[PDB]
Amino acid sequence: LTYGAPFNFPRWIDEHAHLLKPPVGARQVWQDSDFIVTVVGGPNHRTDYHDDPLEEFFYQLRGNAYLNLWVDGRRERADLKEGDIFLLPPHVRHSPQRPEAGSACLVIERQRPAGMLDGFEWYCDACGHLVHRVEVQLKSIVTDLPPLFESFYASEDKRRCPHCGQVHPG
Amino acid sequence: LTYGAPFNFPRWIDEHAHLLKPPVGARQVWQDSDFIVTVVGGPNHRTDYHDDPLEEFFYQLRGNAYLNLWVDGRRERADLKEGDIFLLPPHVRHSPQRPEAGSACLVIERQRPAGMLDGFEWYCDACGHLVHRVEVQLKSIVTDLPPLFESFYASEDKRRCPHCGQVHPG
Ligand SMILES: Nc1c(C(=O)O)ccc(Cl)c1O
Ligand SMILES: Nc1c(C(=O)O)ccc(Cl)c1O
Ligand SMILES: [Fe+2]
Ligand SMILES: [Fe+2]
Ligand SMILES: [Fe+2]
Ligand SMILES: [Fe+2]
Question: Which residues bind substrate (chains A, B)?
Fold first, then answer.
């Protein structure tokens, strides 16, 4: 049993509540597994969209959240009300908004193999064009993402929309 | 959204309770997805052991169950008490026992790629030797498993232990 014995999930979540809020936001349950199993808390809003080459499973255990999506070339929104489950197909662009403190969402993903890249994207509030995209070989979510977001926020040119000139707020 | 919108999980389980009991036992949530997401009810006991080449995720939503394992060359048991989660590493032999009516376990697995086979095994109650093993390219759990189990139960030679001569009960 390389990942240990069964354990009570509500108590695990209770015990890690202080990581389930800014600034950490989320905590991985088991390390170095093929299934990446995370609990995500809140509050947290964000402007980036995720392009995951594989499926994502959501089970909104506590509180309510929602996903900003690009569904059919249009800005759409999928609500994760408390008790909801959801399977997200590969490559659907999604931007999770988690407004509530104390919320908890079970999120299950797959380790990406070598050369299968994730994308992180920003779109213009005024004209809906892609403003900036970066692709990454994601090895640890908490380690390799913050500097990416930061370099976007720090660069006016990276936030400048190539279509209408509006500088994304970051 | 090829797999539909988010939906309430407790209500889904309630609605499918009549499939969550003999003879069906279990119901897949979404079809033709990479993540195979199933809810398993009860009662059900069984004698076969599963050799899954990939990881298995368990979240025991309702009631209690347990897994007979072969952990370190010894018969062992992992309890799934109500509220427990658990990640099973690849190739750990497991035989789920689900004694309680009305229980519900969320089980998440991966679609096996071509040429990655599952194994189903029986061991002798008297000497612990492998009695019989079959490997299968598992494409649909409910379709390709019952005839396998049945052909084991129907054959005295298949149930005859090659080490001590005892005929497995089936
Ligand atoms: N969808 C998420 C979320 C989320 O939904 O907020 C947090 C962390 C990770 Cl790794 C995700 O894939
Ligand atoms: N572990 C299981 C179970 C179980 O735990 O009873 C039922 C169906 C499937 Cl497809 C599984 O992988
Ligand atoms: Fe994601
Ligand atoms: Fe623009
Ligand atoms: Fe299994
Ligand atoms: Fe034997």
Answer: 56, 98, 109
Ligand 1 atom 2: the closest Cα is on which residue? A107
Domain assignments of chain B as residue spans, ordered by start: 8-170
Give the span between the Cα atoms of B162 and A71, in whole angstroms. 58
Stated length of chain B: 170
Resolution of this structure in Å: 2.1
Cα torsion angle, A40, A46, A48, A49, sign = positive
C-beta of residue A151 within 8 angstroms of C-beta of residue A108: no
- Contact state of B85 with A6 under an 8 Å Cβ cutoff: yes
The Cα B84–Cα B106 span in angstroms is: 11
Half-sphere exposure (Cβ direction) of A62: Cα atoms closer than 13 Å: 16
Q: In what order do the strands lie in the sheet with A7-8?
A: A7-8, B84-88, B56-62, B104-110, B35-40, B26-28
The per-residue b/e assignment along A104-115, b for 16 or more CB within 10 angstroms, e otherwise, is bbbbbbbebeee
Tokens describing residue A87: 């399977």
Structure token pair of residue A116: 């299968």
Count of alpha carbons within 13 Å of B108, Cβ hemisphere only?
Answer: 27
- Report how this structure was experimentally obtained: X-ray
- Both tokens of B154, joined, read 């129907």
Report the C-alpha gap between A68 and B80 in whole angstroms. 35
Atom of ligand 1 nearest to the CA of A98: 6
The candidate with the shortest Cα–Cα distance to B133, out of B145, B143, B148, B122, is B122
Give contacts of A12 with chain B, Cβ < 8 Å: 85
**CA end-to-end span of chain B, whole Å?**
44
- Please report, in range form, the residues annotated as the binding site of B for O2: 46
Distance (Å) of CA B113 to CA A79, A152, B38, B117: 32, 38, 19, 8
CA distance B38 to B61: 12
CB A3 within 8 A of CB A12: no
Residue B19, SS3 per DSSP: helix
One-letter identity of residue B62: R
Strands A56-62 and A104-110: antiparallel
* Whether domain A8-170 has CATH 2.60.120.10: yes
